[PDB]
Design a protein around this ligand. Sequence first.
Ligand SMILES: CO[C@H]1/C=C/O[C@@]2(C)Oc3c(C)c(O)c4c(O)c(c5c(nc6cc(C)ccn65)c4c3C2=O)NC(=O)/C(C)=C\C=C\[C@H](C)[C@H](O)[C@@H](C)[C@@H](O)[C@@H](C)[C@H](OC(C)=O)[C@@H]1C
Lengths: 542, 542, 529
Amino acid sequence: GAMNNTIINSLISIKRSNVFAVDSQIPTLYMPQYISLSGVMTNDNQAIASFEIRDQYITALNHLVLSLELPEVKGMGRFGYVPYVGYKCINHVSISSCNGVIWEIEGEELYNNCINNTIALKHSGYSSELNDISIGLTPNDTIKEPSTVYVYIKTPFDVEDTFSSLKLSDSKITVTVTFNPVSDIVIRDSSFDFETFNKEFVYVPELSFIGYMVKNVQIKPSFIEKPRRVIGQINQPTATVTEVHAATSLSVYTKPYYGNTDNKFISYPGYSQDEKDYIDAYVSRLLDDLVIVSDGPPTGYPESAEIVEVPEDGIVSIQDADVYVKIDNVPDNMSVYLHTNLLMFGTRKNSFIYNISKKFSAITGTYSDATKRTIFAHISHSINIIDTSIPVSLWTSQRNVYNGDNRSAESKAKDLFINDPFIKGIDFKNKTDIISRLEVRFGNDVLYSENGPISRIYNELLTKSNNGTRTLTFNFTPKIFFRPTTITANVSRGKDKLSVRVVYSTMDVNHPIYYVQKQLVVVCNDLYKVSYDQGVSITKIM
Amino acid sequence: GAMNNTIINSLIDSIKRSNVFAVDSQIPTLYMPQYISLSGVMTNNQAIASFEIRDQYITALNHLVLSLELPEVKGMGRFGYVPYVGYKCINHVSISSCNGVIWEIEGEELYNNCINNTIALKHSGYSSELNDISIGLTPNDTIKEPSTVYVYIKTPFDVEDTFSSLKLSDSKITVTVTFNPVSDIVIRDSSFDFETFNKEFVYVPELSFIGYMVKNVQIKPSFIEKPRRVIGQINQPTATVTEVHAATSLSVYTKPYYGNTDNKFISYPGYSQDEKDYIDAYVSRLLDDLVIVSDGPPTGYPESAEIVEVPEDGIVSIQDADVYVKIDNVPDNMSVYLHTNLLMFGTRKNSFIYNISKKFSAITGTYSDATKRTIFAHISHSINIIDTSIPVSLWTSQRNVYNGDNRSAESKAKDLFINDPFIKGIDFKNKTDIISRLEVRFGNDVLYSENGPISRIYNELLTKSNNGTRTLTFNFTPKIFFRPTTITANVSRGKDKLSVRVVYSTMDVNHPIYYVQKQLVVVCNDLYKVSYDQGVSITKIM
Amino acid sequence: IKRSNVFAVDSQIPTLYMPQYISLSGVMTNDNQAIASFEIRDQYITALNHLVLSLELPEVKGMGRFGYVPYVGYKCINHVSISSCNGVIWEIEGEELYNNCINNTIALKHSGYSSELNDISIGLTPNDTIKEPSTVYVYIKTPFDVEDTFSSLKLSDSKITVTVTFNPVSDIVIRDSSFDFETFNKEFVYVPELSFIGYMVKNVQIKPSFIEKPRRVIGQINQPTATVTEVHAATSLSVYTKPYYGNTDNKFISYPGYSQDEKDYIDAYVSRLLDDLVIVSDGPPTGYPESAEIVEVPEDGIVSIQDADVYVKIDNVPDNMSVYLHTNLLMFGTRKNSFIYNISKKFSAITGTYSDATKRTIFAHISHSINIIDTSIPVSLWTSQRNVYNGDNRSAESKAKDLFINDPFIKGIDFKNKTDIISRLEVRFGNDVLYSENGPISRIYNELLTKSNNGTRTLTFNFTPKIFFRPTTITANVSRGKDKLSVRVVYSTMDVNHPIYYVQKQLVVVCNDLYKVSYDQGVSITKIM
Ligand SMILES: CO[C@H]1/C=C/O[C@@]2(C)Oc3c(C)c(O)c4c(O)c(c5c(nc6cc(C)ccn65)c4c3C2=O)NC(=O)/C(C)=C\C=C\[C@H](C)[C@H](O)[C@@H](C)[C@@H](O)[C@@H](C)[C@H](OC(C)=O)[C@@H]1C
């Protein structure tokens, strides 16, 4: 009939496993409930939220979600939230019992664990409404409407759902959330009254979790991976994690330190977070001053600026670099001018110069008589992600022989303070790999060494993530159903620590990014045993 | 050698260890799969397709895929299919045996179950060829070329492939598919001859499934989740699901009711389905009438229209709202005009007014002498997804004291009839969350209550979906291999019904969306036991 | 009542092991095809999985247009073979490895998918840098990765040799005539390094496993049949089409670069044609063949090319100049009294503004009917013997901008594999019809079951969980002649006056044969029969 004759003839003693039917096992009798709790706020006057979970009927819990009520932002100036605002709010999270800390994570590490989860990232705050830079005109004008963001606190209790869930029978569980200053989660200009905003802003958190009421629970001991972070000394290529006895993994990455700067940047693309989006935003900001259509030489620029009239030929020569500038519908009384030194950096008076005007090759557009502006059609340039990641301070630094920032006062007023706590590398997109070589030593012996980021490639492949780190995985054994595979220590032979040594690729000293400080971050996942005898407790595997 | 000495020494016995590097290859049940396609029996007012599966060699089946041959669309006017046309075709699907209905789903619920599946959605019809609004010029001009769409009928028999598959214990399985009217799956204008199209259109279905010929099948009873929806009365914040005895989940969402309207809308973005795409399409449609370049006052607009000449400063004042309009290359004989009341709403003669022209702040462009039209460069506006989702009827409703629709006859002729059966909320993107509070009661007692959509956040996280609903999950136990965890009823205490009560957000009476009728939809997944003794049969768990 | 514990689990003690990421430099050998050999012999390397081949791409200096094919790393691979002293354990053809990784976005990005690598860069001076040196990572997906440590290739004190055969550099490069490929081909050398996750296992308990080995068969040019012989235990059978560009110079009018969407391919083509399609000139335009029919646009704006009307309106046109439309830019016809495929007719509206400063036409909006097929027509077919007309009426400037595309993994008849050219599929086991279809329902099931947007007409026989079970296979009957799989397709009929009708097709049939992995006295595989 419907089945082909060749198949029916091929089919129509050996022990065979049933693949078409299964005995439906009766599970443990339980009832789940989505429980939300309001916390206790406390105040370096850091904001701390405490959530106490104690209920006879709450037998187990998993899937922690922290909601945050972002207030209405009213006033004058430019304002916007950092992408994934909710995760950036978190400085530290700790789940503890009467016997102490059961599990804890640093804000950045929780974000790193959720970077592959698109849904969790969108929930935490990723919209044009939240992340684009909105402007307030009147002192009562609404810049940002109030919104609620949801931060998924990924814990090891979620790995195998009910099986991995944190059991809390006859024990009090306290979820403590430490918040980063509101400065970190906000991108604003000088016009914005941050002083008042910081005073008026208050974190409004509410912890939600999936609670389980289990009838006659059969609690058995489990294993947990607890992350440990070590941040090296400023620009130092070495960091050491002490007392390493049973580690499942070791992650190594770099972070920029903007202490020597005012955290002000020329441009920000807002919601659009692609590398091209960052570059286009920068080009757009520079173009206002780069090509000027004026009646006689342009005014409102520093004496230091070298604004040159574009010849009939269209080509302007800034040293070896040629810039083709051709604007249409230019009035008979006006000429086309090019700012030949918009941003320039040099450590010596007659040496190499890093000039941003030289990074442009062709600028075409049409002058609008109605709006008295220049509408740019096509731009041919060599601007990179690093250029957009240079803090304004480094252009006007003492290392610079030249003035540095030759932009108009109008353009300089549009600069934005960016204090994102989770920036990696030396650029906003973490594009540039500054680690030339990695060395990992377990005790005094070399555990691993690499010249290329092959550990990052394996991390990206194995975790199915596009934003991985140089990670050394020691556990390839299935989680929850097995005791994780760990590096075994030998205290007697001094093999009880992990020492990381990197070799940073050095930059040109005449390039402003050379002066961006670096920090080596080393993350270690230590193995602990969860014991439930007389309350919940953890014990370090040694 | 290749392995580091520190590792070699660390390893080079007493404890019992599970083999993680090898496994005993289990011999499976002897079977042979086959992709079987069947032509059905068409019945009619609603189109019904019946597919009879009766074969001794077809032991089990799963993965139902319904194919649909869409005809060539010839004639005059604007025409396009709704996105994911194939799913929108479906009104109801039912898999039944001689012992009755085994499993059934409402068209919208099948779509909601597949909303996270990008592949299944693309297969059902998501292309510029199908969804963009094409125009026919001559009565024989081809608007749409014939195409075939594939609708994946996701059933509980697919969860664990061969293990979950529907077994055919020498029984006749009848797959019944009820189709929605062709009006629902089509977006057209007044120019399109729908009358003839509706008469000429016929659903051409073909049911495909993966059939399995199993040698010596060992059938065991299984469990199934059957969905049951309840739609509450027009503009009512309550709905009750009766005879709830064993439920695995409960979903709650809103649907708009467009009965009081002609289902006509000003704009549609076509294939491009982003929120910005919907907004841009609307702005584009309004701009034709909003800014006019004419020799003297513009003509072809109602007497009710207040078209004002743009002054030398460029700013036009519509009450408190200021509109900056500056067009380049305007001929000496012509002037720039702004329609100050393109679309307006009001309930009283001298109260608040919702004017779409006020929603604009800046309009810049250049007049093209060659095409005699205005090419808009940049638009600064406050137009939202709700504005685009307002049916034209509401602008010209009796409630409105003003005329309402002050557009040109040209613009009004371009309006499109949208009858998508799966619209949620009050806008085309289901952006606006109109549920301010949710209350779910099991009898007299409150089972669950929320002020924020935390149940929607959990649904989105747990299902890895970007388009979730406020869902209460009671079953966190692995499917197929276990009896699902259900909310247990108490008939004696009157706890055998689920009552849902919402608190809708209060809107302004001078805003046309206030008059968009709402309907509360509550979906319940009831647990049933699949019995194979003397044919396939289902029994409600009570 | 007896209940299964769903809230707790006995944490099983695993096999004592220690993993290590091991990288190895190979031995290069030279139809003078480049071959890299990697010898893995270590007493302490007990097992291995997750093979990643790194490639150091050199600095490209010189003149002309140059760019790498998307996912350059995968396209470099012609064949990969993992073998022991007992012979080949597992092997795959370059295209099949790519097809197995097409659903993996991460692996694809690693192999080379960037604006830096895939956009078409231009070199102006003989020392100008076209492309900066870069390193690409190719994930060699093997059956040893399916269940991580459980599926891993065990090395029972045996020598494992990973052999990688490389495709010519011509395949992975998109270049113009201006680019000195002759010198580039001589100077280019593949620089590979094989990485894998090695495992040192204390007291390993090796048990025999099962492996699926892919076998492809390519049919003769324009033959709708292909047969896979000695089929005894197959888990799946994939059927697809590949274009053959032997009868062409592999030159194409346009390429979109990094932007790989269907619209991106179309927009790139429209952009290339627009330079010649609408001309603003002082008197009739020059520099075009005599065959070209460039017509002046009337005051009305509408130009009539037969039944097709083209609205052309350019702003700020000088008083001494007029707007001209090329009414036959690219045309094809088999007879002088037949239907004509004219690319100029595929346009309905062209609007723009003439820039006096740059002496150029800046196009604002284009209304056209150009498709993915149009963008996939090799230039050779426009100037084909079958065409009674000239064919390519473009300027010499436009013709010089054409790019040589030799991507080895092109499927169907278009660059996006959009057009389905199989009207009917017939699969025969022996001489009896095993499966037959009129629609690509096997492709729909493949796309659904594998969660891939780029599937093939695949017949899956194994729906049993991998590694933990012996795979379900189509059982053969040699006595009844049922020991071969014969595929017969019916190609979808195309119009003879459309240039794409002349694209030579090749039927590709892939069979996954079941083998048993034996570890007694070294690693060995045995074909299940
Ligand atoms: C969701 O499907 C599950 C099925 C449960 O019901 C049973 C009765 O049917 C099985 C089928 C059909 C199987 O193929 C296996 C299986 O291959 C199996 C299993 C199973 N149960 C196990 C329990 C433990 C403690 C360890 C290993 N286990 C197992 C089970 C069952 O327990 N595992 C093994 O045989 C081997 C050799 C190794 C380890 C495999 C890891 C531990 C699993 O893949 C694990 C991560 C997990 O996915 C599974 C244990 C699954 O269980 C859960 C809760 O996730 C099962 C595949």
